[PDB]
Amino acid sequence: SEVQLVESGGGLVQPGGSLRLSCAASGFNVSSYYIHWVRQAPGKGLEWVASISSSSGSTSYADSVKGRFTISADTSKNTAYLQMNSLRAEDTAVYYCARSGYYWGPYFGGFDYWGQGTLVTVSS
Amino acid sequence: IQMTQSPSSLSASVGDRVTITCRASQSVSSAVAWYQQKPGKAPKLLIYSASSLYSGVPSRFSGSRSGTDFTLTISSLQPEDFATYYCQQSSSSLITFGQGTKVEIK
Amino acid sequence: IPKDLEPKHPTLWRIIYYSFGVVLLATITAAYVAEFQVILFSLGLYGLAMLLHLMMQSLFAFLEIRRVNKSELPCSFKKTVALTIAGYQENPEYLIKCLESCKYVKYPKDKLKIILVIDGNTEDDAYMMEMFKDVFHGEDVGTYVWKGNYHTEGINMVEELVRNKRCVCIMQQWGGKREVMYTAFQAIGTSVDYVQVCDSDTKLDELATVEMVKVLESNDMYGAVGGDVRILNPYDSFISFMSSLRYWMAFNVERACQSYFDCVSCISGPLGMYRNNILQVFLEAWYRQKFLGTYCTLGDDRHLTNRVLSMGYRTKYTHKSRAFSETPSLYLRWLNQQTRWTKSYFREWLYNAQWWHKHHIWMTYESVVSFIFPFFITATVIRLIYAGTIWNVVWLLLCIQIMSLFKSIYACWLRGNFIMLLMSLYSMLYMTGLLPSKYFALLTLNKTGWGTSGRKKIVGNYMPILPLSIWAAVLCGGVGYSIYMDCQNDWSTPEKQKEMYHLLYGCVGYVMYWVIMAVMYWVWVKR
Ligand SMILES: O=c1ccn([C@@H]2O[C@H](COP(=O)(O)OP(=O)(O)O)[C@@H](O)[C@H]2O)c(=O)[nH]1
Ligand SMILES: [Mg+2]
């Protein structure tokens, strides 16, 4: 089959509110691979946000993401889920959902089969 | 923890060799990958593990490692090879991306 | 990176250990010649010596088991483990059982990497790759068909696939079990922290890997560890049951006692784990090994354990890791396996003669007693058979059976489930088919060829008949000479009358015990 990733849930949200994003995966299993969320601010570069590995409980966040955002996964629904709270103006970007293998030692394999982008607008 | 893409800008003609190098604070147990992103398009993986190349990409792209420096080289700059190149350090509980290094025609 | 461990002062432990070994050998030999030159009491003394050795071993094993059970520590799932499997011509059933067991290991999937190497790249080995692809369909699976080995390009592809993917399958040209293991170890590199080895006919318990990681994470001095591999087909034949009993005795007495002193001589191939750094350090030396039994090349799990001990890192053993492996049911296949094992042991004895000063003195004691036991047993049997009296032969057989019965009773005591009483029949296999096999293995160290083929085209190789025939002829000639001499002896005296009655009663008791054991085995195998 063909590996596909679709991002949904973007939109306009008032500052200080809550937002939900879903990453639906096709052609593979979420539990067998890593899922990461990458931010691309307008006029800036790619920035990592959070990552998770299903069937293992491993979870990671960035320094500015810890304590605010949460990431989960649903193997039955094969969908990654990102819940963002206490939103601020600097949180507007084009969120990306990426897939990868495992870390092992010094060999990773990179972020292959990148998904599309979803827009989040946090302004009053 | 800190990643620096040295050029941050490059202007080369078609056929000129292009070299982009990346500096990392530490690379003892972290892999380095090189991605290419076009304006408005999602990035695509080019080089993984800092030495191997992804299947399907042209063989022109080459990756090398020397100490804490990681180098990406393009032998011939094709007319469709003008985009923004991102250097990423991947590790558990910490992932850092690069910036800049957009190859443009001259 | 791993420093080569070494005692504080050589020429101060080496000399003492060598002198202790020489003194022990000289004392045992002197006692043997003293008994020989100046019938019931000598055999009794041998029996008490064996009994004391058994009590020492069992006490140390019990202490180690209690220490392992009492001590506990929660495990942090942060160490990567790589399971390496090799398959030559395995039966589809055993291969599929091993694959499912490896897949269903209760370990995190992001810390576990499975690699399989097929010894053959022709069209008759693609089925193993087919099953591997079918099993690990939903994972990051990568398969390659190499046209050669590391000692015959494809090297870069193999290394990239192994180090960048979770599930890997590689075919390679025929080079034996050494080539596949070397290829897997070389392709591992520094990706993982622990490398577990497994055969393609072994089913693994879910907690085996977890317990092995727990026991290897307690101290940094440990370099290797093994588990309690059992038999998944103990009812295929009579010899399978004996192999199961011997396996349990080995892995629950000898391995436990050696692990108490941290001197486990051999780590089981089906269930064994090693530290990655040390393994990569000694891999090249392990492959390039010779001068054992002339100049023939060697290398196996026993050599891996010997290298680990040589580098100074102690090897442990935990009973909470369980596995099931198949064993030959035919008599000749079992004999060939035993000859190969004894050849490997004899070759490794010379290499392990050194490195004794690094890990305790129990290793030296066990090595010397295991080296000198079969020769003394053979000499005693030959002398008692050639004595020329039915009396002496009868008590010889009776003492051999009484010692085995006492060992089996003590085994029942320590085991606690009473099926262990069947081990008393192992004497008829050790004294008729195993000693000539050991002699044949000693006489043909310069040869090789494994001996047993894969489980697809089961084959013959009836060579072990010659040692069996020689041993049977020697025994028959000895008994004939003894019976001739005793029939041409004096009788009708009260002493000879009492001797005749005593030997008749002894024969009656012997046959009663034999038929009791046969009935017990028949009932336990039918019901
Ligand atoms: O030339 C050979 C013979 C065997 N093996 C494999 O090595 C392991 C050990 O073989 P075997 O079962 O004969 O050893 P045993 O269990 O009998 O001691 C098995 O997975 C075999 O398929 C191999 O790779 N090459
Ligand atoms: Mg086996």
Side-chain angles (χ1 to χ4, degrees), chain C residues 346 374-375 378-379 434-444 467:
Chain C
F346 283 144
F375 292 81
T378 303
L434 225 45
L435 270 162
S437 86
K438 288 189 183 172
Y439 265 51
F440 197 51
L442 192 173
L443 248 56
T444 89

PDB file of all heavy atoms in Angstrom, chain C residues 346 374-375 378-379 434-444 467:
ATOM      1  N   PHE C 346      37.037 -30.534  24.567  1.00  0.00           N
ATOM      2  CA  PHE C 346      38.462 -30.846  24.561  1.00  0.00           C
ATOM      3  C   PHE C 346      39.272 -29.730  23.918  1.00  0.00           C
ATOM      4  O   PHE C 346      40.351 -29.379  24.408  1.00  0.00           O
ATOM      5  CB  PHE C 346      38.707 -32.172  23.843  1.00  0.00           C
ATOM      6  CG  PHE C 346      38.373 -33.378  24.670  1.00  0.00           C
ATOM      7  CD1 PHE C 346      37.816 -34.502  24.087  1.00  0.00           C
ATOM      8  CD2 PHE C 346      38.621 -33.390  26.032  1.00  0.00           C
ATOM      9  CE1 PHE C 346      37.509 -35.614  24.846  1.00  0.00           C
ATOM     10  CE2 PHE C 346      38.317 -34.498  26.797  1.00  0.00           C
ATOM     11  CZ  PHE C 346      37.759 -35.612  26.202  1.00  0.00           C
ATOM     12  N   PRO C 374      36.669 -39.355  33.496  1.00  0.00           N
ATOM     13  CA  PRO C 374      36.389 -40.477  32.582  1.00  0.00           C
ATOM     14  C   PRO C 374      37.520 -41.484  32.481  1.00  0.00           C
ATOM     15  O   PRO C 374      37.261 -42.691  32.393  1.00  0.00           O
ATOM     16  CB  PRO C 374      36.131 -39.779  31.236  1.00  0.00           C
ATOM     17  CG  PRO C 374      35.843 -38.360  31.575  1.00  0.00           C
ATOM     18  CD  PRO C 374      36.666 -38.067  32.781  1.00  0.00           C
ATOM     19  N   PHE C 375      38.773 -41.023  32.498  1.00  0.00           N
ATOM     20  CA  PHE C 375      39.897 -41.948  32.397  1.00  0.00           C
ATOM     21  C   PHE C 375      39.960 -42.871  33.607  1.00  0.00           C
ATOM     22  O   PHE C 375      40.172 -44.082  33.466  1.00  0.00           O
ATOM     23  CB  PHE C 375      41.205 -41.173  32.244  1.00  0.00           C
ATOM     24  CG  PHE C 375      41.331 -40.449  30.933  1.00  0.00           C
ATOM     25  CD1 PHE C 375      40.718 -39.222  30.740  1.00  0.00           C
ATOM     26  CD2 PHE C 375      42.063 -40.995  29.893  1.00  0.00           C
ATOM     27  CE1 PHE C 375      40.831 -38.555  29.537  1.00  0.00           C
ATOM     28  CE2 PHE C 375      42.181 -40.334  28.686  1.00  0.00           C
ATOM     29  CZ  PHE C 375      41.565 -39.112  28.509  1.00  0.00           C
ATOM     30  N   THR C 378      37.110 -45.407  33.409  1.00  0.00           N
ATOM     31  CA  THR C 378      37.427 -46.459  32.449  1.00  0.00           C
ATOM     32  C   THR C 378      38.457 -47.429  33.013  1.00  0.00           C
ATOM     33  O   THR C 378      38.326 -48.647  32.851  1.00  0.00           O
ATOM     34  CB  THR C 378      37.930 -45.845  31.143  1.00  0.00           C
ATOM     35  OG1 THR C 378      36.949 -44.934  30.632  1.00  0.00           O
ATOM     36  CG2 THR C 378      38.196 -46.928  30.108  1.00  0.00           C
ATOM     37  N   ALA C 379      39.489 -46.906  33.681  1.00  0.00           N
ATOM     38  CA  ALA C 379      40.507 -47.775  34.263  1.00  0.00           C
ATOM     39  C   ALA C 379      39.917 -48.677  35.340  1.00  0.00           C
ATOM     40  O   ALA C 379      40.222 -49.874  35.391  1.00  0.00           O
ATOM     41  CB  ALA C 379      41.651 -46.937  34.829  1.00  0.00           C
ATOM     42  N   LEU C 434      28.567 -43.500  25.715  1.00  0.00           N
ATOM     43  CA  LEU C 434      29.127 -42.168  25.907  1.00  0.00           C
ATOM     44  C   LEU C 434      30.637 -42.172  26.115  1.00  0.00           C
ATOM     45  O   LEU C 434      31.321 -41.279  25.613  1.00  0.00           O
ATOM     46  CB  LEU C 434      28.449 -41.474  27.091  1.00  0.00           C
ATOM     47  CG  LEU C 434      28.046 -40.019  26.838  1.00  0.00           C
ATOM     48  CD1 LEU C 434      27.373 -39.887  25.484  1.00  0.00           C
ATOM     49  CD2 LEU C 434      27.131 -39.508  27.937  1.00  0.00           C
ATOM     50  N   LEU C 435      31.174 -43.142  26.854  1.00  0.00           N
ATOM     51  CA  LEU C 435      32.627 -43.239  26.993  1.00  0.00           C
ATOM     52  C   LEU C 435      33.327 -43.547  25.672  1.00  0.00           C
ATOM     53  O   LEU C 435      34.330 -42.879  25.360  1.00  0.00           O
ATOM     54  CB  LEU C 435      32.973 -44.271  28.073  1.00  0.00           C
ATOM     55  CG  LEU C 435      33.097 -43.736  29.500  1.00  0.00           C
ATOM     56  CD1 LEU C 435      33.000 -44.869  30.507  1.00  0.00           C
ATOM     57  CD2 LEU C 435      34.398 -42.969  29.674  1.00  0.00           C
ATOM     58  N   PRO C 436      32.891 -44.528  24.869  1.00  0.00           N
ATOM     59  CA  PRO C 436      33.504 -44.686  23.540  1.00  0.00           C
ATOM     60  C   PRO C 436      33.322 -43.469  22.654  1.00  0.00           C
ATOM     61  O   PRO C 436      34.208 -43.166  21.846  1.00  0.00           O
ATOM     62  CB  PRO C 436      32.793 -45.921  22.968  1.00  0.00           C
ATOM     63  CG  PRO C 436      31.536 -46.035  23.747  1.00  0.00           C
ATOM     64  CD  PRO C 436      31.885 -45.575  25.121  1.00  0.00           C
ATOM     65  N   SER C 437      32.200 -42.758  22.782  1.00  0.00           N
ATOM     66  CA  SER C 437      32.018 -41.525  22.023  1.00  0.00           C
ATOM     67  C   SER C 437      33.037 -40.471  22.435  1.00  0.00           C
ATOM     68  O   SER C 437      33.588 -39.762  21.586  1.00  0.00           O
ATOM     69  CB  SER C 437      30.595 -40.999  22.210  1.00  0.00           C
ATOM     70  OG  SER C 437      30.500 -40.186  23.365  1.00  0.00           O
ATOM     71  N   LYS C 438      33.300 -40.354  23.739  1.00  0.00           N
ATOM     72  CA  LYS C 438      34.320 -39.425  24.211  1.00  0.00           C
ATOM     73  C   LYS C 438      35.695 -39.810  23.686  1.00  0.00           C
ATOM     74  O   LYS C 438      36.479 -38.945  23.275  1.00  0.00           O
ATOM     75  CB  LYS C 438      34.326 -39.383  25.739  1.00  0.00           C
ATOM     76  CG  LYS C 438      33.136 -38.663  26.347  1.00  0.00           C
ATOM     77  CD  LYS C 438      33.317 -38.460  27.841  1.00  0.00           C
ATOM     78  CE  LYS C 438      32.096 -37.796  28.457  1.00  0.00           C
ATOM     79  NZ  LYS C 438      32.173 -37.766  29.943  1.00  0.00           N
ATOM     80  N   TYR C 439      36.010 -41.108  23.695  1.00  0.00           N
ATOM     81  CA  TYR C 439      37.301 -41.554  23.179  1.00  0.00           C
ATOM     82  C   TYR C 439      37.432 -41.255  21.688  1.00  0.00           C
ATOM     83  O   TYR C 439      38.493 -40.817  21.224  1.00  0.00           O
ATOM     84  CB  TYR C 439      37.489 -43.046  23.450  1.00  0.00           C
ATOM     85  CG  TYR C 439      38.259 -43.335  24.719  1.00  0.00           C
ATOM     86  CD1 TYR C 439      37.899 -42.740  25.920  1.00  0.00           C
ATOM     87  CD2 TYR C 439      39.346 -44.198  24.713  1.00  0.00           C
ATOM     88  CE1 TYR C 439      38.597 -42.999  27.082  1.00  0.00           C
ATOM     89  CE2 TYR C 439      40.052 -44.462  25.872  1.00  0.00           C
ATOM     90  CZ  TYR C 439      39.673 -43.860  27.053  1.00  0.00           C
ATOM     91  OH  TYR C 439      40.372 -44.119  28.209  1.00  0.00           O
ATOM     92  N   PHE C 440      36.361 -41.484  20.924  1.00  0.00           N
ATOM     93  CA  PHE C 440      36.380 -41.172  19.498  1.00  0.00           C
ATOM     94  C   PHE C 440      36.551 -39.678  19.262  1.00  0.00           C
ATOM     95  O   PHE C 440      37.295 -39.265  18.365  1.00  0.00           O
ATOM     96  CB  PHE C 440      35.097 -41.676  18.839  1.00  0.00           C
ATOM     97  CG  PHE C 440      35.181 -41.778  17.344  1.00  0.00           C
ATOM     98  CD1 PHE C 440      36.224 -42.457  16.741  1.00  0.00           C
ATOM     99  CD2 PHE C 440      34.212 -41.199  16.541  1.00  0.00           C
ATOM    100  CE1 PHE C 440      36.304 -42.555  15.365  1.00  0.00           C
ATOM    101  CE2 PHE C 440      34.285 -41.293  15.166  1.00  0.00           C
ATOM    102  CZ  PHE C 440      35.332 -41.971  14.576  1.00  0.00           C
ATOM    103  N   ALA C 441      35.866 -38.851  20.054  1.00  0.00           N
ATOM    104  CA  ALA C 441      36.014 -37.405  19.921  1.00  0.00           C
ATOM    105  C   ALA C 441      37.438 -36.969  20.238  1.00  0.00           C
ATOM    106  O   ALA C 441      37.982 -36.074  19.582  1.00  0.00           O
ATOM    107  CB  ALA C 441      35.017 -36.691  20.832  1.00  0.00           C
ATOM    108  N   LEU C 442      38.052 -37.586  21.248  1.00  0.00           N
ATOM    109  CA  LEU C 442      39.442 -37.283  21.571  1.00  0.00           C
ATOM    110  C   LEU C 442      40.378 -37.700  20.443  1.00  0.00           C
ATOM    111  O   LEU C 442      41.335 -36.980  20.137  1.00  0.00           O
ATOM    112  CB  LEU C 442      39.822 -37.967  22.890  1.00  0.00           C
ATOM    113  CG  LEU C 442      41.111 -37.671  23.673  1.00  0.00           C
ATOM    114  CD1 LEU C 442      41.057 -38.401  25.003  1.00  0.00           C
ATOM    115  CD2 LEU C 442      42.387 -38.060  22.938  1.00  0.00           C
ATOM    116  N   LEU C 443      40.120 -38.844  19.809  1.00  0.00           N
ATOM    117  CA  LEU C 443      41.023 -39.358  18.788  1.00  0.00           C
ATOM    118  C   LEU C 443      40.908 -38.638  17.450  1.00  0.00           C
ATOM    119  O   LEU C 443      41.837 -38.725  16.641  1.00  0.00           O
ATOM    120  CB  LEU C 443      40.780 -40.854  18.580  1.00  0.00           C
ATOM    121  CG  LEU C 443      41.902 -41.788  19.037  1.00  0.00           C
ATOM    122  CD1 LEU C 443      42.232 -41.557  20.503  1.00  0.00           C
ATOM    123  CD2 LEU C 443      41.525 -43.241  18.791  1.00  0.00           C
ATOM    124  N   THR C 444      39.807 -37.934  17.190  1.00  0.00           N
ATOM    125  CA  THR C 444      39.576 -37.279  15.902  1.00  0.00           C
ATOM    126  C   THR C 444      39.264 -35.800  16.095  1.00  0.00           C
ATOM    127  O   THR C 444      38.298 -35.266  15.546  1.00  0.00           O
ATOM    128  CB  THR C 444      38.450 -37.951  15.116  1.00  0.00           C
ATOM    129  OG1 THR C 444      37.195 -37.356  15.467  1.00  0.00           O
ATOM    130  CG2 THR C 444      38.402 -39.448  15.387  1.00  0.00           C
ATOM    131  N   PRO C 467      33.299 -47.109  17.521  1.00  0.00           N
ATOM    132  CA  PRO C 467      33.604 -47.081  18.963  1.00  0.00           C
ATOM    133  C   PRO C 467      32.666 -47.946  19.785  1.00  0.00           C
ATOM    134  O   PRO C 467      33.108 -48.605  20.736  1.00  0.00           O
ATOM    135  CB  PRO C 467      33.472 -45.594  19.321  1.00  0.00           C
ATOM    136  CG  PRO C 467      33.637 -44.874  18.034  1.00  0.00           C
ATOM    137  CD  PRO C 467      33.019 -45.758  17.005  1.00  0.00           C
TER     138      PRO C 467
END
